[PDB]
Scaffold this active site. Structure first.
Site, mmCIF file in Angstrom:
data_model
loop_
_atom_site.group_PDB
_atom_site.id
_atom_site.type_symbol
_atom_site.label_atom_id
_atom_site.label_comp_id
_atom_site.label_asym_id
_atom_site.label_seq_id
_atom_site.Cartn_x
_atom_site.Cartn_y
_atom_site.Cartn_z
ATOM 1 N N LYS A 40 5.379 11.146 6.600
ATOM 2 C CA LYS A 40 4.690 11.073 7.864
ATOM 3 C C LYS A 40 5.462 11.695 9.035
ATOM 4 O O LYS A 40 5.347 12.929 9.258
ATOM 5 C CB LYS A 40 4.335 9.587 8.134
ATOM 6 C CG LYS A 40 3.281 9.142 7.111
ATOM 7 C CD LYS A 40 2.270 8.171 7.732
ATOM 8 C CE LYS A 40 1.399 7.467 6.672
ATOM 9 N NZ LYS A 40 0.346 8.368 6.169
ATOM 10 N N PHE B 10 0.849 -1.180 0.000
ATOM 11 C CA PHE B 10 0.000 0.000 0.000
ATOM 12 C C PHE B 10 0.887 1.232 0.000
ATOM 13 O O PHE B 10 1.792 1.346 0.832
ATOM 14 C CB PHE B 10 -0.942 0.028 1.208
ATOM 15 C CG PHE B 10 -1.917 1.170 1.174
ATOM 16 C CD1 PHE B 10 -3.078 1.079 0.426
ATOM 17 C CD2 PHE B 10 -1.668 2.339 1.869
ATOM 18 C CE1 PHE B 10 -3.977 2.130 0.382
ATOM 19 C CE2 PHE B 10 -2.568 3.392 1.826
ATOM 20 C CZ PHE B 10 -3.719 3.286 1.084
ATOM 21 N N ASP C 169 10.191 1.679 0.486
ATOM 22 C CA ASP C 169 9.140 2.564 0.980
ATOM 23 C C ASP C 169 9.168 2.525 2.505
ATOM 24 O O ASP C 169 8.611 1.619 3.127
ATOM 25 C CB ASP C 169 7.787 2.134 0.420
ATOM 26 C CG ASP C 169 6.653 3.066 0.827
ATOM 27 O OD1 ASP C 169 6.874 3.964 1.668
ATOM 28 O OD2 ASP C 169 5.534 2.895 0.296
HETATM 29 C C1 LIG Z 1 -0.890 7.990 6.029
HETATM 30 C C2 LIG Z 1 -1.369 6.536 6.339
HETATM 31 C C3 LIG Z 1 -2.806 6.278 6.543
HETATM 32 C C4 LIG Z 1 -3.049 4.703 6.398
HETATM 33 C C5 LIG Z 1 -4.319 4.357 5.957
HETATM 34 O O1 LIG Z 1 -5.068 5.221 5.447
HETATM 35 O O2 LIG Z 1 -4.713 3.177 6.082
HETATM 36 C C6 LIG Z 1 -1.924 4.498 5.294
HETATM 37 C C7 LIG Z 1 -0.892 5.545 5.484
HETATM 38 N N1 LIG Z 1 -0.060 6.046 4.350
HETATM 39 C C8 LIG Z 1 -0.181 5.182 3.172
HETATM 40 C C9 LIG Z 1 1.285 4.904 2.589
HETATM 41 C C10 LIG Z 1 1.847 5.731 1.614
HETATM 42 C C11 LIG Z 1 1.056 6.949 1.059
HETATM 43 O O3 LIG Z 1 0.988 7.939 2.097
HETATM 44 P P1 LIG Z 1 -0.077 9.229 1.959
HETATM 45 O O4 LIG Z 1 0.455 10.383 2.782
HETATM 46 O O5 LIG Z 1 -1.447 8.827 2.488
HETATM 47 O O6 LIG Z 1 -0.200 9.650 0.509
HETATM 48 C C12 LIG Z 1 3.138 5.425 1.151
HETATM 49 N N2 LIG Z 1 3.812 4.376 1.632
HETATM 50 C C13 LIG Z 1 3.315 3.570 2.561
HETATM 51 C C14 LIG Z 1 4.127 2.364 3.100
HETATM 52 C C15 LIG Z 1 2.032 3.820 3.066
HETATM 53 O O7 LIG Z 1 1.492 2.990 4.040
#
Ligand SMILES: *C[C@H]1C[C@@H](C(=O)O)C=C1NCc1c(COP(=O)(O)O)cnc(C)c1O
Ligand SMILES: *C[C@H]1C[C@@H](C(=O)O)C=C1NCc1c(COP(=O)(O)O)cnc(C)c1O
Lengths: 404, 404
Positions: free
Chosen positions: A257, A142, A228
């Site tokens: 994050k 994801f 990632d």
């Molecule tokens: C920000 C967070 C929120 C959960 C969820 O909604 O379930 C997943 C997270 N981030 C997803 C994610 C990204 C993309 O980050 P965004 O800031 O939301 O665009 C990238 N890489 C990984 C490993 C992630 O889990």
């Protein structure tokens, strides 16, 4: 009087898109490891906004950085230089030992940037014919909700009704070195993008030696290793990068994050010159990417992570947390897993009793966690938590679990 | 000693990606219409960060909103409710008279969201066969740098070397109603996405009646009218939305940039229930999307636009700017165009003299503008500019242009 929790729920239901089904709790204040709702109830935060507040909510040093910079300058766009961006770039590149960084805002933007870098490098350096370059992903991955991100997903809820999908994305099983080797037999593969621990899949930790083997295979076949670390990086798993547990140096590192302590959307793409410089001026960017306010925030957030030694604390307290969680009976909890303070448990869901009910009862008992897949529950408190607070939270978890 | 401008340039060159070639100026402070560089020199900002600081740099009301909210709570993630989001949602939906809003962070995320909404509505409401849905774009469009966004671009700097590209995107000429009528004969078209004024293409203003014709054709053929107002909205052209000049109601409106006054990445997708509710819980979202800090900032930014009547000021002063610019001789300036305070000039680019050199000399004379291509220069100062300040900057532009 002010809105109640149900007032807030109903207002959002009336005026906002229904793209989320949040846990029924209406927060208005956050400080360190704690959250307060509009009624004044206090909660342990055991999600940490998916690691965005590794440093705790509203960490005063990051808050002070934001307040200081907002009176000076917040956004010039990249059409001009601001005085902050280069300071942040030098700091972060020297911290993670890469030549260069490309700043973006959200995690998915960092992932898209990495895909574009991998493709441009495949065409201009590796010599792939346009446009035959492939990027390989691991099932269960994801990294966002853009059309590109959902085109690499194996989750129907992400991609159903949203096609057609981006070509050139291939999927192999996670934690599978032979599958990766077979996939990399194809010379048109430009990159392999993978999470060192799959967070959204339910904190799926691959076997020891997996990242080392991924590095070896990518180097042998002239393929970019994109790690990632948007969720796993920045001390959450007990190291600066989860990849550090096996001394693995990816070709491209994605950060996000916790990079801002939750005060500003900041993400980063780290790699060396031979990859970074395949993108020429005018060929990529974004309006807010690299703005001075976000850069001040990110400098302060990284400094908090280093000064307070939050990776060591996460390692120690995660050992303690997993050991206490494994004390729970095996006919209510079937698996405990994780690294550092990124952990999860698996309950043997019945038709009567699932992870959502457990999280509701945890909410009632003063701890906020999120379920996943109906049987996974993530436990990821801020890295600034102390041992006594952690043990109070652990006893709350025990009482809530065995109260069913 | 503090870094000089050359020090800043060199540090970014060493540690940052080379995805931009900014005008060589190093800003450290901004207030209202003015920017200051690290040597202390003062400049008129005539880019306004691509309209993100329509309200001027560091507007005190927006700064106060940010500072007040950052003390309370900045990010819980969408796994829980925060008390601020619904207030912002009610406010913005009532302001623009749509049922619902979907909050995002960047403009390209809003565009991706609108594409996903259009596809989902096309399959589940219009009845298009999966996955045959098409979205029509206008040549010259710009809505970001994701793989999807560049797949719809006709600018080779955007897409060359970054394929393979997202299928299902069709391109027709801008400002061309017969072409749209021909394109919408395909029953598989779910939407037409268009800018009321193409900004990144060089401020391309379509002919009067174009937007009414677009609305008419989209309604006749059951196609969603998506208006990208990320650059043109929020008073920049003299109206809340540029589409207000023709009083047409798009099915989806995209907002960004000025939505925060430059203090936070905030974007928004506005549409009615029959479109918005095709997306179910868990099918779209973002981690910083709809966070309380960004929402407080956006409320204050919209309130600033309303209270200071910035649309009326932009409308009144833009015609002064255009009329003065049209007095320059045709030997140097071949075209003047724009609406409100979104304007551009086209210069008679020789091999000896181009838009970049004009902008370097503008910088030398205390005004900051950046060129697109070799012959277009945008003039877009913040909407808080007064008439005497505008005429001073017009004097600067006259002296600079005629000094060649
Ligand atoms: C920000 C967070 C929120 C959960 C969820 O909604 O379930 C997943 C997270 N981030 C997803 C994610 C990204 C993309 O980050 P965004 O800031 O939301 O665009 C990238 N890489 C990984 C490993 C992630 O889990
Ligand atoms: C924001 C801006 C600045 C330059 C640049 O960064 O190169 C061009 C921009 N306009 C982008 C834009 C978008 C995408 O917004 P982002 O926040 O950059 O993702 C969407 N729609 C329109 C009409 C845009 O102009």
């Amino acid at each position: 009087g002010p809105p109640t929790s149900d007032d807030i729920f109903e207002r959002e239901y009336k005026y906002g898109a229904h793209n989320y089904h949040p846990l029924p709790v209406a927060l208005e204040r956050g400080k360190g490891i704690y959250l307060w709702d509009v009624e004044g109830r206090k909660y342990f935060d055991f999600l940490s906004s998916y690691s965005a507040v590794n440093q705790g909510h509203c960490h005063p040093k990051i808050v002070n950085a934001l307040k200081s910079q907002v009176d000076k300058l917040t956004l010039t766009s990249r059409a001009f230089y601001n005085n902050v961006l280069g300071e942040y770039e030098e700091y972060i590149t020297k911290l993670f030992n890469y030549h260069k960084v490309l700043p973006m805002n959200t995690g998915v933007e960092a992932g898209e940037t990495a895909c574009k870098l991998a493709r441009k490098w495949g065409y201009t350096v590796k010599g792939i014919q346009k446009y035959k370059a492939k990027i390989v992903f691991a099932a269960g991955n994801f990294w966002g909700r853009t059309l590109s991100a959902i085109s690499s997903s194996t989750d129907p809820t992400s991609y159903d009704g949203f096609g057609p999908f981006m070509p050139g994305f291939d999927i192999i099983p996670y934690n599978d070195l032979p599958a990766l080797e077979r996939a990399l037999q194809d010379p048109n593969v430009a990159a392999f993008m993978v999470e060192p621990i799959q967070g959204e899949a339910g904190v799926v930790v691959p076997d020891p030696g997996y990242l080392m083997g991924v590095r070896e295979l990518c180097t042998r076949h002239q393929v970019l290793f994109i790690a990632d670390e948007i969720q796993t990086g920045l001390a959450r798993t007990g190291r600066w990068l989860a990849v550090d547990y096996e001394n693995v140096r990816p070709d491209i590192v994605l950060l996000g994050k916790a990079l801002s302590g939750g005060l500003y959307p900041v993400s980063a793409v780290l790699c060396d010159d031979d990859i970074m410089l395949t993108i020429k001026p005018g060929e990529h960017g974004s309006t807010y990417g690299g703005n001075p306010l976000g850069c001040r925030v990110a400098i302060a957030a990284l400094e908090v992570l280093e000064e307070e030694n939050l990776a060591e604390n996460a390692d120690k307290l995660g050992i303690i947390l997993r050991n206490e969680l494994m004390k729970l009976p095996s006919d209510v909890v079937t698996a405990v897993r994780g690294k550092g303070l990124l952990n999860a448990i698996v309950i043997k869901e019945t038709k009567d009793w699932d992870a959502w009910k457990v999280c509701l009862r945890l909410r009632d008992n003063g701890l906020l966690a999120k379920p996943t897949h109906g049987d996974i529950i993530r436990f990821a408190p801020p890295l600034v938590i102390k041992e006594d607070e952690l043990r109070e939270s652990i006893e709350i978890i025990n009482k809530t679990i065995l109260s069913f």
